[PDB]
Amino acid sequence: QSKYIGTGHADTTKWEWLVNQHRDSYCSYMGHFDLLNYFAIAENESKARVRFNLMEKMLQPCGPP
Amino acid sequence: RRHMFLYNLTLQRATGISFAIHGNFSGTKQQEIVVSRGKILELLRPDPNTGKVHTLLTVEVFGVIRSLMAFRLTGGTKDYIVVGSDSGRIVILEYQPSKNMFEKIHQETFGKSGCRRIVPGQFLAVDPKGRAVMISAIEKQKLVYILNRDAAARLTISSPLEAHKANTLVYHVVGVDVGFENPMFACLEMDYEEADNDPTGEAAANTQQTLTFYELDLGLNHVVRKYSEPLEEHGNFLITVPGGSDGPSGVLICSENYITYKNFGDQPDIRCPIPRRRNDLDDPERGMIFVCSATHKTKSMFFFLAQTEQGDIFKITLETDEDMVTEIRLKYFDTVPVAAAMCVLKTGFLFVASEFGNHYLYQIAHLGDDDEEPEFSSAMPLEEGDTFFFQPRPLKNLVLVDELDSLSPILFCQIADLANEDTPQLYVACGRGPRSSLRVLRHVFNQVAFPLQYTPRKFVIHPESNNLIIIETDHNAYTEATKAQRKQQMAEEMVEAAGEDERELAAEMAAAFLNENLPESIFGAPKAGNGQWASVIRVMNPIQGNTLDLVQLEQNEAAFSVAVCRFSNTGEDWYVLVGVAKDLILNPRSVAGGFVYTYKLVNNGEKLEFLHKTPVEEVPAAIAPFQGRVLIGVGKLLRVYDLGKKKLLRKCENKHIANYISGIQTIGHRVIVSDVQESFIWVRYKRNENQLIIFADDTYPRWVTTASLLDYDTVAGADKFGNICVVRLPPNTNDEVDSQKAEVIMNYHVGETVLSLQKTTLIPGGSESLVYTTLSGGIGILVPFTSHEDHDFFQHVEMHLRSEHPPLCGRDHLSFRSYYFPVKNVIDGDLCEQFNSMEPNKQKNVSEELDRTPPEVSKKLEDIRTRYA
Amino acid sequence: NLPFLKPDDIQYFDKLLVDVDESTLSPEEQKERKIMKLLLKIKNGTPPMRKAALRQITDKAREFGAGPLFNQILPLLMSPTLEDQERHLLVKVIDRILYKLDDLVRPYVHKILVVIEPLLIDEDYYARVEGREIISNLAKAAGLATMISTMRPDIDNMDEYVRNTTARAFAVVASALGIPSLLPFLKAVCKSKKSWQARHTGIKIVQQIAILMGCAILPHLRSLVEIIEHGLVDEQQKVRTISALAIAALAEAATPYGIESFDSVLKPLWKGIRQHRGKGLAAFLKAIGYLIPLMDAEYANYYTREVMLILIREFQSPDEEMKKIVLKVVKQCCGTDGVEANYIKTEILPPFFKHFWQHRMALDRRNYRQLVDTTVELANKVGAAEIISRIVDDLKDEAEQYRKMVMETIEKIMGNLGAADIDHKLEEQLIDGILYAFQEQTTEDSVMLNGFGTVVNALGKRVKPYLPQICGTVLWRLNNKSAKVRQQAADLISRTAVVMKTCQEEKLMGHLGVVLYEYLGEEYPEVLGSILGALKAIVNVIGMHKMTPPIKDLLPRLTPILKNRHEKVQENCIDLVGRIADRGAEYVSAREWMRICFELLELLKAHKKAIRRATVNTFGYIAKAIGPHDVLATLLNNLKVQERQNRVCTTVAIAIVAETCSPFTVLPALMNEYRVPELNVQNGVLKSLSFLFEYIGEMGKDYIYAVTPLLEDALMDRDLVHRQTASAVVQHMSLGVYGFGCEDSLNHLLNYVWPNVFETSPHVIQAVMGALEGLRVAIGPCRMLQYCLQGLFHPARKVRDVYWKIYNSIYIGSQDALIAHYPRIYNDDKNTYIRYELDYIL
Amino acid sequence: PDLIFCRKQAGVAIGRLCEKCDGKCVICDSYVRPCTLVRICDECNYGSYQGRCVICGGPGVSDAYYCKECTIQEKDRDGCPKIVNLGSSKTDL
Ligand SMILES: *C[C@@]1(O)C[C@@H](/C=C/C(C)=C/C[C@H]2CC[C@@H](NC(=O)/C=C\[C@H](C)OC(=O)NC)CC2)OC(C)(C)C1
Ligand SMILES: [Zn+2]
Ligand SMILES: [Zn+2]
Ligand SMILES: [Zn+2]
């Protein structure tokens, strides 16, 4: 279970859990077409630009520890 | 009452496109196009004689298509279709023109289901000779299958080969035309291991994107990570350049403001800046990237078509000295709406699948070459600060031969009989930006389109005049006045700081610039700024396309709510309230305040007379009439307002709403508040004592989009994640007792995001139904069952088709409709009607198990559709 | 420590036995000792030892050098006592060290090859696979030029067999480095002016490249053909034969694409057909036979009409290999589009059936199979009757093998094409030949049985006039002394029952049934099973009312047969009892049914799966017949009194009763049995409930509320076995009612399952985790997340341990659905934690 | 004990089972509802182990199936289900 990214243990910090769920969310946005559509309609940007901004946010979606 | 058992049917299939590929799928010399509508795989055939697109096959795959590519074996005559899905499976399909179906040739399993982070499915890349395919996740895991044929010329797949690399994110993957060498796959990767272990944030900015090459050794049968070169600026996707005998192998990295060519070995990297638009009205700090690409190979030459954010399509050619490439050449081809995929067919036709709005098929008339238009190159010198420039112009190289109607994206819908016909009409506010539209749909459907100016958010109908009051709002956009002001300031800057004696030339050029108003419909709208907002209030006749009155708003005022109502203080004269946010930043969220415009609606439902403008703390997101007064949601506050001479006057408020009010609907003295995340909240208004007390909520979090009250205790709602729920209060719930929790009596995943639910009767003299609309352009209905016999029959039909006719892309149907919540009391009719698509033996067996005959089952399903209810 | 050493390992690892301080070691011998220890840990050792030793031998391979490693590896591989898996381990270590020593092995290439090449001709398929693997890795490391220089001398050696080994090695290196990497060398060697052995070996290389790489040579097919084409007109005869054979292998590999690549080969072959004789003619014909199915219809017609003269001439060839070649060539020609059926019927069929269909060909097994398959393929184009009528009269032959051959051919043809092409004369010929072939049998040919059944089932209702003549033979055969012959007749009845029923000859079938009834005492078990299957086939097509002997008489005779220990008898008897119980249950009293129950309950623990399958089905049938009450009560008593495996069978039988008769008939009595104070009775009830819900699945969507109080009590009964079994029950319930609206009752039971998550006993915590996962899939991951969040972060380290175990289970279960259920975590001073994108509102 | 699942990535090889374990599910040890066909990795079907029982490596007679419960919970999507004894060499037994 250690190999699957996102799993945790008793010493999992708040930051680790939340960056995990943020990257999960970004990948879920990339996967589900209508979620990305909603996002691109909200902030008036092309779908490719929204995907690029999400992939850019994958580095530190929450900030440094 | 009894639990409601529902039956789901799609009346209008989804019309948006996320992927499009072209090839010889029939095995003949004709070329077809396979498109992905989201949860639907479709096959289209453009007729080169009449220049019009026909649909040959449409299939519900009951999954999420995340990647789509076509390939062909060596010496083959027909192209296969590889589909990356939200199941842990890869599928390869062959189209059979005789049976008119997608035969599943191969289905191989590797991971778990869902749009997961480390499970392959998102990216698909095939070797140009068809010898292998690679399915990749966005993180870590990558898998390669080897494709071959056998004695009988049937496709064969191998076991997966592991190409994983921990802590590695993937931007894009594509195969490299290395001829018949060891197949190679190029990936745009980035390692975040350094950025996570540096609590100062330096490693974040220091980590850079890499171009990596994965080689598949066939003789050794394994994948190895050979070359990995860091890149200067971050690129969004890759293009395979033809290699082997007809072209030099390599890759084209598309980045922000640049396009680079790179190849392994002594090949020098050759970059070229992207030509910006001359007199670009956008923000100077805004970059420019490519949104999609296409490739067309001929025995003579080959070129690429790359479209920018502004919709400009450029033709790209590669000039090569022997083995190496000298320079990249780019010239302005044309301007079409922003597309998600482009296909350059043989026999001279281009197919443009727009990311939103209608789709287009053009005939290529002149490739170019015989043009005086400037061609740009990567060798032309240019200072570090400057770039190339070009001027947009009307279509020259393409001609519109067909236009395909697409309702995506639908942002609001009202089903009502505004015309004096008997059957109700569907009034759908959809489209995006300058390509938005209000469409009247009538009895699969017949559509009439009236163009709008910005993206519609919500519209209301005036009961007395039957006219429509629409609000259109878009982010980072300029208003009409601000657009004219920017044009004038640009023209003033143009004449000044120019050379004397040639300032005469600057003046005539700037006059021409001011005279030219380029159509935002085709050329896109000049949109810029982070917190800028363009909003417009419109009055429209539902019969004609005419606009009756129009109100532009401030450069930072964005409308989000609208309602028309009579007031008890002021007789029967109508009013129009419009909620507006000011200085709204989406990320991170920050708003200065909000306003509520009160208009009089003076003429016979034709003119808006500004009464006053009430300020308020946060954005007014919901406005609904309530017994001679209005209920307004501002932020997480729910207030009752009454009309005053100079303001809208607060009379009672509720503060304990969880997060933020996104919509409110009332029946009786009960108000149903939709929260952005914490689902529905039942609040009660006490006329005596004038207090708004929360008496019920829900036990699950729901990102509610829309809602519709079925009865006094029952509410139907929709998710951002494409779900529909029906939640009912306990029967003996007292509005006096606070701690009451609602029970969810229905759950169902549509697979597409719903933005309008309405309980109506589509055909007079029919039963009631729950009609939902789709952000991807679909229209569906949920029908209540009349008897338990029909319920058991259709439930057994669902079971037998789940077993004997599984979804096409490896998904499990019961798992799929249980995407976020397990299914509760819904039957999937879109699956049940696939009984007519099975083979004779399967149909006979299923009908015999149902103790019926196959025509009888088809008749029953068709009858449920004839009811439309 | 050191692994165990077999007798044979002593020779190779003796030095490891003596204990010597590794300070007083020569530098070379120091390395020899470590390589010995590493190889011994690899060859004999646990998978951890193997993995660690692989890492160590590959990481230090460059420091170790190639010489000593390959010296210790080759004798180990050449050991005659090497077991098959040890060879695979050695091949893997060879690959992983050859990847490291890229250029280091270039000196030793030759040596390695002379040890490895025999593996390429070993009889073991995996031995050849491993040899090819290591030669490929060698060629990848050593490089093209090193391998070419190493193997080039033996190309012209006089011994044909060393040339064959060299050509196979070259084909392997071609598959390892690619066809174009060796294309110039092959172009040079195929036209070598030095000797003819060099060009023969180059053409053999091309042939083996085809044989090895199959469809992968289609890209370079034109290149290979152009390099090899000149060999067809050479002065040497052996090189012409081998060039034709290589062309044949290339055509076999490129099927069905790439005819245009052989454009410069058609006329040389066409001329050589009329020129050459003997083995070279056979090679030319084989090449043409593998080349025709690649052509167009009209050109296939032309070329086949061109070659058919010599093809017909070579039918009467004395050479057996030539016969096999021309037979395969005929099969290939007549299986293509373009060769017309009337053309085959006119020109090919008379000589075919004159020279080929003789008793001699039936004696050789290879020719037997070849001719049978070829004639069936011919029938697939020229028509069934046009083939059958030419050999149907041979069914009355003195030689039994020839009758067997024609029977197999007719069987396969009529099974592929039916009997619509057969006229009355051929029908009577078929019947009169088949009856004589069946009556005249020395052994018990299964081919005769299969053919009889196939012909009868293909004729269908057309066999009515012959049915008395057939049943007379079947009756006379059931009296025959040979038991295998009796079971053959019984299996014929079993296969022909349906057609007999369609023929409206129900009195003949009644006579057959009443004749089989007296044979139910057959001591030989296989014959008993066959006659039971025959009785079942007769029952299943004729009514239960007109069945003779009547069912009331038949079933009690079946009752004691269930005690037989033969699995064929058990299966057929249980299946016949089930056919009786499904529809004929009214003719049998409930007491006999209870005795059948008692015998079936014992058979629920048979080792063969089919017996348990049949026992479950027929017990369900007899449970619908009997009614729930009596069998239910006696099963509950058996549950109390019995334990171990025989209790599990009563649990299965209770679940069967619950599935057949609604669980409302069984659940009250079981839950009442829970009321007894004794703990063992309670454990039995809990096991019954677990298997009952696991068995009935969706049927339990209405009985969760009913069993909820008992589960409430059992989940707090202190006895860990109770809570373990109750958690299993909740698990099976959740998995069974998934998606049927049982969220209320299951959510309620979750609150009683939850407190038991803090338990150290391994089995019961395993059961509780399984129940929690089932509840996750039935309720939804959102509720499980709601229950996990309160303790995901907690001062107690053990509470965190347990709750994170649960959360990992949930997260692995449904990572994508959780995106909608994570709580709002507000931004703090240093980091941005709120998912702003989801807060957008349109 | 010392027995663990292979858990490597499964390939095109179909899992196989001997007579004594004909209808059992490799994971949960249940006979109720065979659902999806078992797939083993490419190493566990090599050489002498081809077509061998997943639990014992003995001669197999029937295809191995995951049950319906395991399919619902996607336990068929985990690694190769062949059993390996970490305390036995390849030559032993
Ligand atoms: C791999 C294995 O676990 C196999 C076992 C053998 C177990 C046997 C022979 C058990 C008998 C036992 C099985 C369960 C019960 N009977 C039962 O469930 C019968 C039928 C069911 C409903 O249907 C099927 O079985 N369908 C296929 C009671 C009797 O041996 C070991 C060594 C433990 C290894
Ligand atoms: Zn299982
Ligand atoms: Zn394995
Ligand atoms: Zn076994």
Side-chain angles (χ1 to χ4, degrees), chain B residues 1 4 414 624-626 631 663-674 680-683 695 704 706-718 724-729 745 756-760 768-771:
Chain B
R1 304 141 281 271
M4 39 183 56
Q414 283 290 323
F626 187 50
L631 275 150
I664 53 146
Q665 292 202 350
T666 68
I667 282 298
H669 264 298
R670 268 190 184 176
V671 63
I672 314 318
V673 175
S674 316
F680 300 111
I681 298 177
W682 286 259
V683 185
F695 75 98
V704 179
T706 189
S708 180
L709 282 86
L710 311 179
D711 62 56
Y712 190 65
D713 292 347
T714 311
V715 178
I724 302 182
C725 68
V726 178
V727 193
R728 180 179 287 164
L729 278 186
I745 69 173
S756 90
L757 275 168
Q758 183 171 346
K759 177 179 64 68
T760 189
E768 222 164 14
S769 45
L770 194 55
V771 195

Side-chain angles (χ1 to χ4, degrees), chain A residues 3-15:
Chain A
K3 283 53 161 193
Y4 207 102
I5 313 309
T7 60
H9 45 69
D11 291 330
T12 305
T13 80
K14 180 167 169 174
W15 182 84

Side-chain angles (χ1 to χ4, degrees), chain B residues 766-785:
Chain B
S767 305
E768 222 164 14
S769 45
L770 194 55
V771 195
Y772 67 84
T773 199
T774 287
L775 199 58
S776 192
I779 303 169
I781 57 138
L782 309 170
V783 172
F785 275 104

Side-chain angles (χ1 to χ4, degrees), chain B residues 74-75 112 115-117 149 180 560 587 589 659 677 699-700 703 720 795 799 814 818-820 822 824, chain C residues 218 257 698 738 740-741 743 778-779 783 786 812-813 815-817 820-821 824 836-838 840-841:
Chain B
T74 295
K112 296 183 174 295
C115 297
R116 287 180 179 257
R117 179 169 146 207
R149 63 167 87 263
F180 292 103
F560 283 101
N587 213 317
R589 184 151 182 299
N659 290 143
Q677 172 172 0
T699 54
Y700 293 107
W703 304 86
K720 293 193 179 181
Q795 198 174 0
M799 158 199 311
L814 180 53
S818 299
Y819 221 105
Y820 298 92
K824 194 168 174 57
Chain C
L218 191 58
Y257 297 108
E698 72 154 349
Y738 163 46
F740 291 96
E743 297 97 359
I779 305 285
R783 185 71 60 184
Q786 288 174 355
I812 296 180
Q815 169 263 310
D816 194 10
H821 315 317
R824 316 193 55 95
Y836 289 109
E837 284 90 358
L838 288 169
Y840 295 1
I841 286 299

Side-chain angles (χ1 to χ4, degrees), chain D residues 25 28 67 70:
Chain D
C25 162
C28 67
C67 68
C70 287

Side-chain angles (χ1 to χ4, degrees), chain C residues 604-607 609 612 616 645 648-649 652 691, chain D residues 20-21 23-24 29 31 55:
Chain C
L604 280 177
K605 59 182 184 63
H607 300 265
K609 176 183 61 182
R612 302 193 301 267
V616 167
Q645 259 190 13
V648 188
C649 295
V652 174
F691 187 75
Chain D
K20 196 181 183 180
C21 293
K24 231 187 193 81
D29 271 345
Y31 293 99
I55 318 184

